[PDB]
Write a protein that holds these residues in place. Structure first.
Motif, PDB file in Angstrom:
ATOM      1  N   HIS A  50      -7.551  -1.276  -5.667  1.00 41.44           N
ATOM      2  CA  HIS A  50      -7.345  -0.807  -4.302  1.00 41.44           C
ATOM      3  C   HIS A  50      -8.289   0.335  -3.966  1.00 41.44           C
ATOM      4  O   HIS A  50      -8.710   0.480  -2.814  1.00 41.44           O
TER       5      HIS A  50
ATOM      6  N   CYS B 248      -5.238   5.217  -2.067  1.00 40.23           N
ATOM      7  CA  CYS B 248      -4.122   4.334  -2.362  1.00 40.23           C
ATOM      8  C   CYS B 248      -3.901   4.256  -3.867  1.00 40.23           C
ATOM      9  O   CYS B 248      -4.819   4.462  -4.662  1.00 40.23           O
TER      10      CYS B 248
ATOM     11  N   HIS C 103       0.829  -1.193   0.000  1.00 39.90           N
ATOM     12  CA  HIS C 103       0.000   0.000   0.000  1.00 39.90           C
ATOM     13  C   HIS C 103       0.868   1.249   0.000  1.00 39.90           C
ATOM     14  O   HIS C 103       2.045   1.215   0.360  1.00 39.90           O
TER      15      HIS C 103
END
Ligand SMILES: [Cu+2]
Ligand SMILES: [Cu+2]
Ligand SMILES: [Cu+2]
Ligand SMILES: [Cu+2]
Ligand SMILES: [Cu+2]
Ligand SMILES: [Cu+2]
Lengths: 334, 334, 334
Positions: free
Chosen positions: C139, C130, C89
Motif C-alpha cells: 500500500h 497507509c 485502508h
C-alpha cells in the motif's frame, strides 16, 4: 569592486593522495588562484585479475586533484580538451553559485579550451564532477570527479573555539565502477567508449556496483603505496564520494574531529567510530595517532570493503603503549 | 600508574535483549571488570519455513551479549575457543585503541584461550565483531557481533545538562543473513561451514540480504517474547548494526533523546521519528511511554521490515488518554 | 480541559507541489482544524513510454496533500472510502501518539467513513501513510503517503535565534515504484490490484526500484510544470520520503538552512550541499536565490536521478551577477 587589483598566484596540482603546497592560515587578502587541468581518456586496470575499463580523467588520474583555496578567494580554472579525445566535457563545482555550478559555461568539444572564474564564498570541502547533458552518470562513474577545499581565513576550530592545526593532509577518493559482464559471467571489452555506452547504461540500471576502489584501483593504498605517519602527528583525511553513500572507518583508531558533511561553519562531532558521508559530498576527519603499527582504512560495509576492494593502509612509526592495550595472557592451549 | 591496585569485579553476561546488573552512576574509581565469552558454532533456524544456517556466536547467541562498563575502567576479556569448533576466531573492539582494535593479539585456534585487557577511554556505545584475515564479512554476517556500552562516570545528560536516568535497558541487534539459494530458487544446506564458504561469498557479492532479523530470528521479539514496559517508565534501547545501515522506528512513539552515532560526548537530538544508524555502529534511544497498548519496533525500510522480518513488539501497561488521541466517529457506513 | 471551547476552522487541501493558505505565525490559541480526504484507486502513467500501474491515493494524487497546522493545535481528519474501491485502508500519522499512530482506529472498508482527532504536540515535518495489517509495503509503495507540517507558534528560527520568514513553500514527494516485469523484460499489466499483489511482492523482495519519480511521474516537475521563483525570494522546500533514503541536491545552489530530520526543536545546519533524509521521514530546506536561470533539483544518486527519473526544475527570474561567477574566456579552439 575591481578584480584587477587582487594579487595572482599560480599553483601546480599534484596526483592524489598528496596535496599541493599551501598555508593553513591566510597571510593575504583575497587573491586569484590559477589552476590548469587537462582532460584525458585512457584504459585503466582496476583490479588484480586485469579488468580493463575506459576511464575519463582530470589530469590523468582517478580521482582528480584536490584544489585548496581560502574563503572569499577567486578561483580561476583553465580547462583544456585535447584533440585526441572524442567526447564533450564540462566541469561542475558544488562550491560555485548559479549556472548549474558552472556546467552551462564550460562545455568544451575535443580540441578546445575554456576559462571559468568564480568566488569561493563558503568554507568546507566540496565535490566537482563532469556533467554533460544526457550522459551525467556515465561520465561521473568513470572517474571524472574530485574535491576542492575552501579553508576559513583563520583556520579550523574545534567545538569550543580553540584552533586546530594539522601536520599532514591526505585525500582519499572512493569510486564505484559498474563494469558490464556478458552472459557467461565475464567482463566485456571494447575499443572506444561509444561502443561501451549502451552496456554501461544497462549495467548501471541495476544500482549495484561491480568494483569499489580507493584511489582508482584495488590495493592502490596498501603495500608500498600506503599512507604514512608517526605517533603524535596530526592528519586530516579528506574523503570524497560523488555517486554513492560511504561510511569510512579507521580500524584501531577513531575520528577525533569529524565534519561528516564537510562544512566548517558547523561544529564538528567528537569521538566518532564510523561516520556517514552522503553520496555526492565530501567529508573531513582529523585524527592524532597514539599507537604505532599498521592501520586499516575501510568502508565499513564490510562486503564492499573486503570483497569489492575499498581498503587502504596507514603505517605509523612510534613506540607501543602497554597502558592503553596489552596482551595479558598470550594464546595458550588451555 | 600501577594496575594492580585497582579493585577487580567479575560479571556474568546475560542473553539478549536483557543486560547484566550494573549501576548508572559509578561509585568507585577505575576498576578491572572481568568478562568471559565462549565461542560456539551451531545450526540456527532463522524463519518460520525452517531455513537453516551455520551460525558462529559469542556465548551461543545472535547477537553477542552487551557488556556495560564505566569510562576509564579497564576491560579484561578472556576468550575461549573449544576443541569442537573448526575455525580461527579473534575479537575486535571499536572502543580499544591500536592493533586493529585488538584483532592482531586475540587469534585463537580451536582448543585455545586468550586474555586481552584494554582501557575504555571514550563513553558511548560501540560495536565488536570477529575479523579473521581473509574471512571478515563471512564471519561477521553469520552472527559474530555485539555491542559494549561505556557509560560516563556521572551519568547521561540531556542537551542542556540535567541528568537522565532510565528505568529499563534493552539491547536490540539487527542481523542480515545472505543465504545461498540454488538454481530452482530454494535455499541450500551443508554439513560444515567449509562447504558453505564459496556459495556464501557468491551470494554476498550481490549486496542484497535474504533475511534481516531482530535478535537472530523472525518473530524473535513478537508474541510472548516481546519487550515490556509501563506508562511512565523510562527505557533505553541500544540498537546495533555491524554491516548495513538501519533506520529504527517506534510506531506510535518517538525518540525523546537520540544518540544516532552512539557517542555521549555529543548533545543528543530531540523528538526524532526515524533516525539513521550507519553500518558498523551502535545507537541509543531514550523514551518514556505515554500510552498503553502494543507498539511496533521496525526498520523503516518497510520492505525490509514486513517482508524480510525486521520487526519487534513492545507491550505497555497503563490507562488510555483521550486527550492525546481519540476516535471521534467510529467507522460507520456513511 | 474542554475541547468544545476552542475555535474551529475548515481547510481545503490543494494538489502538490502547492500548499493551502496559512499563516507563518499563529494569531490564535489552540484551535481545531478540519481536513477531508477521499481515498481513490486509479491507473497511473508514470513515465514517457506509457508504463501503467495501479496506484492508490489520498485525494487522487501522488503524493497526498500537505497539511499545515501549528503546535498544540487539534487536527481532526475525516477519511472517506467510497463504495467503488475494493481494499481496506487506514491512515497512520508519525506525529500522533499511541495506537500505532492512529492505524488501529481508522480501518475503513469500502463504502465507509471515519473521523480521528489528535493533538500535534511536536513541531516539525512528519510523514503519514497507509498501513493495513499484512499489506503495509504494498500500500505504501503505490502512492498512499504524504506529509504534515506542524509549525511552531512563534515561527522558524536560525541557529542563533533570529526569525526566518519564507515567501514561498513547495512540497516535493519522492516515490519509488517496483513494477513487476515478465521474463522477456517487459512490464506487466493487470485488471485489479488483487491480481497484481503476488508479482508486486516478488518484485519488492529484490530491494531495487524500477522507477523513482518526483510528484508521481517522470518529468512531472520539468518543463511548463517547473517550480518558480525570483532572485531574492525565500523558498521553503519540504521533501518527503516514506520507504527509501534520499539525498536531495539543488544544482547551482546550496541549502541555507537545513533540517535533515525535519524537527524544528533542533538547530539547523548551514551551507549544506547535499543532505541525507532517511527513509520514512521528511526534511525541510530554506534557500534564498541569488542568480537567475534554470536550476535542477535532483536525488544525488545520479543513477537514480538521470536514469530512473528523480529530477525537477526551478525557474528563477532576475539579473545576472558577474562577480560570483563569470566566463573569462569562452570556449575557443586553442
Ligand atoms: Cu566528462
Ligand atoms: Cu553534483
Ligand atoms: Cu569468527
Ligand atoms: Cu568494524
Ligand atoms: Cu491503503
Ligand atoms: Cu511509518
Amino acid at each position: 569592486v575591481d578584480i584587477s587589483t587582487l594579487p595572482r598566484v599560480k599553483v601546480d596540482l599534484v596526483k592524489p593522495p598528496f596535496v599541493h603546497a599551501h598555508d593553513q592560515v591566510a597571510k593575504t587578502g583575497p587573491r586569484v588562484v590559477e589552476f590548469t587541468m587537462t582532460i584525458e581518456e585512457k584504459k585503466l586496470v582496476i583490479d588484480r585479475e586485469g579488468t580493463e575499463i575506459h576511464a575519463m580523467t582530470f589530469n590523468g588520474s582517478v580521482p582528480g586533484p584536490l584544489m585548496v583555496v581560502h574563503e572569499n578567494d577567486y578561483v580561476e580554472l583553465r580547462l583544456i580538451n585535447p584533440d585526441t579525445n572524442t567526447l564533450l566535457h564540462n566541469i561542475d563545482f558544488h562550491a560555485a553559485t548559479g549556472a548549474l555550478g558552472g556546467g552551462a559555461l564550460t562545455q568544451v568539444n575535443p580540441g578546445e579550451e575554456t576559462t571559468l572564474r568564480f568566488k569561493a564564498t563558503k568554507p568546507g570541502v566540496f565535490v566537482y564532477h563532469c556533467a554533460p547533458e544526457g550522459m551525467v552518470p556515465w561520465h561521473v562513474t568513470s572517474g571524472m570527479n574530485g574535491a576542492i577545499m575552501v579553508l576559513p581565513r583563520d583556520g579550523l576550530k574545534d567545538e569550543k573555539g580553540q584552533p586546530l592545526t594539522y601536520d599532514k593532509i591526505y585525500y582519499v577518493g572512493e569510486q564505484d565502477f559498474y563494469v558490464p559482464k556478458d552472459e557467461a559471467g565475464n567482463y566485456k571489452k571494447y575499443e572506444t567508449p561509444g561502443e561501451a555506452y549502451e552496456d554501461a547504461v544497462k549495467a548501471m540500471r541495476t544500482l549495484t556496483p561491480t568494483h569499489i576502489v580507493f584511489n582508482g584501483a584495488v590495493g592502490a593504498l596498501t603495500g608500498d603505496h600506503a599512507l604514512t605517519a608517526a605517533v603524535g602527528e596530526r592528519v586530516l583525511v579528506v574523503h570524497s564520494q560523488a555517486n554513492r553513500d560511504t561510511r569510512p572507518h579507521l580500524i584501531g583508531g577513531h575520528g577525533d574531529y569529524v565534519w561528516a558533511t564537510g562544512k566548517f561553519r558547523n561544529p564538528p562531532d567528537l569521538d566518532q567510530e564510523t561516520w556517514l558521508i552522503p553520496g555526492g559530498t565530501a567529508g573531513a576527519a582529523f585524527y592524532t595517532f597514539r599507537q604505532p603499527g599498521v592501520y586499516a582504512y575501510v568502508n565499513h560495509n564490510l562486503i564492499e570493503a573486503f570483497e569489492l576492494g575499498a581498503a587502504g593502509h596507514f603505517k605509523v612509526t612510534g613506540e607501543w603503549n602497554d597502558d592503553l592495550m596489552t596482551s595479558v595472557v598470550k594464546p595458550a592451549s588451555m
